[PDB]
């Protein structure tokens, strides 16, 4: 019995490979060869957000592109006014071992989680003036690696128990659960229209999920090692992932395969975030080598370097209006580049 | 600046609270606590009193010890062990009355984040090991053991087999053998930590 199922799965994979190879009539690097290169992308540290006392692990921008939340293993989640460097809130976490945070698109809420397995939903707009936990979401069998709001009432989380889940923040319960990786779901990103999202897993595959139908819609592979970070191309028809294999890749949703690869012989450190600019033409990738590199996402060559940190960058993020790209690292200073 | 100075007052006030919390927390000593499954960890945690990470803590000779039992994580270490890069020492427990612990030590004590961080090694259940050696020889656990089947030598051989696994030369493995009734564990942890702290200070002074 079982051998037949294994053989049929193998044949299904060979049909996948045949179909994907048949569609590869030309490569992106070949098609876009005639496009003018984006040139030397010079950028300078307009702000430095001093005030964290231990390694920063996450950051996220408000939809207004001005407020930012940054969270570190000191046990504080702080909300910054990026235009003035003022600290708007400081939130004492109930446990110091944070690995992720998010800022709701309305700006009403902030979420956070880590080695606790629990994901906490802070309410920033309380009538009592202070900021308090409106809901503690519990149920994962391992650390929560990454989470994002779809809207104020529902948040999607990604965890070290091979599982992503979608929560109803009112009841505090899993409205849907996404089993299917062979390893940790290390990072996640909801698409621009939030109808579907991707997650990069520690089994080196990245999968495409439907948040209404609850099922895996496509599976992408090609890394040799764990995928530390991922996000969609702003059009929502492509996404790019960064591995501990010291390279980033661009995958296409409709062609079901990798379009281009970003690497250079002098680079051996793993990626820790990979985020596009508002046009999609730049892909900014943060590296364990303390550096951050900006890639021409079409021509696939180095546009420049955002070098300003004394320790690895743990996070990166472009504002919604594209006006700046923050970074945050383990030397406890966030920095705004523009 | 208009009512944009009251906002600046708030900014400075919570900056003050951040620093005041931080300078108070920097007095604590952080200790990652580890071992194989059921390797006696909980007993030294119990001697000191008080599904995710499990922080125990205790206070001794004006130090506050934060003592993280991380083993509740049902996931591979590599993707969260870099949280604990900043601990002062790693406390590693081995049950002599039990060998997976030895491979676990081989794996962690050479890990890229911990080549500079020292290990405190507790060989728990020495009394039960004395009982075991009286009834079944150490060769059952180590077929290459070439020596007398007596506690005072077999136990030291196990200690050597553990201490042989560190390949970086920037650390020391502070051993101890615990009979599980001892109250002295706090003092052992404390003065091992004092040695570790002065060694760190000698490195920070460039004198070492």
């Amino acid at each position, epitope marked *: 019995e079982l051998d037949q199922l294994r053989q049929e799965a193998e044949q299904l994979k060979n049909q996948i490979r045949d179909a994907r190879k048949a569609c590869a009539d030309a490569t992106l690097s070949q098609i876009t060869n005639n496009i003018d290169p984006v040139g030397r992308i010079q950028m300078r540290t307009r702000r430095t957000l001093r005030g964290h006392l231990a390694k920063i692990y996450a950051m996220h921008w408000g939809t207004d592109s*001005r407020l930012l939340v940054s969270a570190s293993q000191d046990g504080k989640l702080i909300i910054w006014d990026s235009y003035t460097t*003022n600290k708007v809130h400081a939130i004492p976490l109930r446990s110091s071992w944070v690995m992720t945070c998010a800022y709701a698109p309305s700006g009403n809420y902030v979420a956070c989680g880590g080695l606790d397995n629990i994901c906490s939903i802070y309410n920033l707009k309380t009538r*009592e*003036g202070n900021v308090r936990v409106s809901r503690e979401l519990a149920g994962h069998t391992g650390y929560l690696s990454c989470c994002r709001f779809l809207d104020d009432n529902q948040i999607v989380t990604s965890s070290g128990d091979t599982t992503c889940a979608l929560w109803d923040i009112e009841t505090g319960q899993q409205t849907t659960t996404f089993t299917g990786h062979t390893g940790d779901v290390m990072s996640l990103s909801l698409a621009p229209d939030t109808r579907l999202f991707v997650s990069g897993a520690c089994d080196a595959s990245a999968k495409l999920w439907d948040v209404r139908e609850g099922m895996c819609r496509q599976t992408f592979t090609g890394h040799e090692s764990d995928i530390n970070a991922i996000c969609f191309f702003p059009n929502g028809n492509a996404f790019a992932t960064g591995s501990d294999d010291a390279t980033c890749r661009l995958f296409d949703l409709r062609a079901d395969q990798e379009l281009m690869t970003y690497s250079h012989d002098n680079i051996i450190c793993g990626i820790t975030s990979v985020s596009f600019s508002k046009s999609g033409r730049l892909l900014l990738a943060g590296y364990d080598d303390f550096n951050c590199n900006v890639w021409d996402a079409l021509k696939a060559d180095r546009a420049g370097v955002l070098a300003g940190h004394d320790n690895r960058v743990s996070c990166l993020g472009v504002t919604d209006d594209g006006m700046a790209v923050a970074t945050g690292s383990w030397d406890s200073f966030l920095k705004i580049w523009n | 600046s*208009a009512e944009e100075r009251a906002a600046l*007052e*708030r900014s400075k*006030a919570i900056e003050k609270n951040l620093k005041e919390d931080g300078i108070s927390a920097a007095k604590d000593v952080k200790l990652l606590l580890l071992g194989a499954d059921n390797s006696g960890k909980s007993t030294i945690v119990k001697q000191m009193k008080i599904t995710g990470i499990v922080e125990t803590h205790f206070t001794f000779k004006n130090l506050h010890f934060r003592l993280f039992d991380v083993g509740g994580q049902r996931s591979e270490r590599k993707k969260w062990i870099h949280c604990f890069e900043d601990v002062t020492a790693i406390i590693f427990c081995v049950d002599l009355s039990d060998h997976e612990s030895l491979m676990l030590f081989d794996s962690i004590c050479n890990n890229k984040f911990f080549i500079d961080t020292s290990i405190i090694l507790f060989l728990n259940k020495k009394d039960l090991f004395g009982e075991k050696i009286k009834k079944s020889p150490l060769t059952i656990c180590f077929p290459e053991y070439t020596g007398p089947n007596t506690y005072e030598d077999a136990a030291a051989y196990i200690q050597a087999q553990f201490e042989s696994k560190n390949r970086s030369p920037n650390k020391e493995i502070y051993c101890h053998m615990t009979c599980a009734t001892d109250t002295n564990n706090a003092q052992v942890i404390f003065d091992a930590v004092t040695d570790i702290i002065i060694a760190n200070n000698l490195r920070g002074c460039g004198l070492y």
Partner: single-chain antibody
Amino acid sequence: DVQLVESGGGLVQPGGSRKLSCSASGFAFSSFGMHWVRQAPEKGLEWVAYISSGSGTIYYADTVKGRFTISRKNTLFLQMTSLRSEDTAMYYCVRSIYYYGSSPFDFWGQGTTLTVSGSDIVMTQATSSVPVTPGESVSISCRSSKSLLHSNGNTYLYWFLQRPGQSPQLLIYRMSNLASGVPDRFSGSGSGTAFTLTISRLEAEDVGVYYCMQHLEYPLTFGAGTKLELK
């Protein structure tokens, strides 16, 4: 729920002294900056004193500096000395908190009646009262001697509604934003130096006196007040 209650009213001998106290509950008082505002027995509001979070800064109105003193156990105090005939008023304890997106002046205590035996930004409201009936739509306007639209882009006009027999409620803040819990019928408008609240589909619940206010700099100036009065 949020609550502020004050005590220490009644008759006082002119030239004497009195301490008025404000007791706060239901909110994180230490993090707010607290104001005092006073209403003369038949007239519009006038600002009295301010004390920030952590008591870092304190300000007083021109006719009050050094005669009163403000201090703040979840309790705030106004210490009054040499009470003049003019110092009789209902005194309101008003909370406020300042940070990006915050809403100052958003809750007002019930207030105590106390009675006794040129560079500042001036502000005017063009109409003393407007006759209006439910289902109609109405407009109330306000002007200032100096422009409120500051370099950082905000324009610091605030609008309050006082229903008869109530402490004022904040309706609009920084000239456009609608205060939480306020019905959507209200809207702010105008820019630079002249401002306008628009009421669409007015209701009997909107009958009252409307005060505009500047917050660009101290001393804070309230408008003379416009009574939107029924029929």
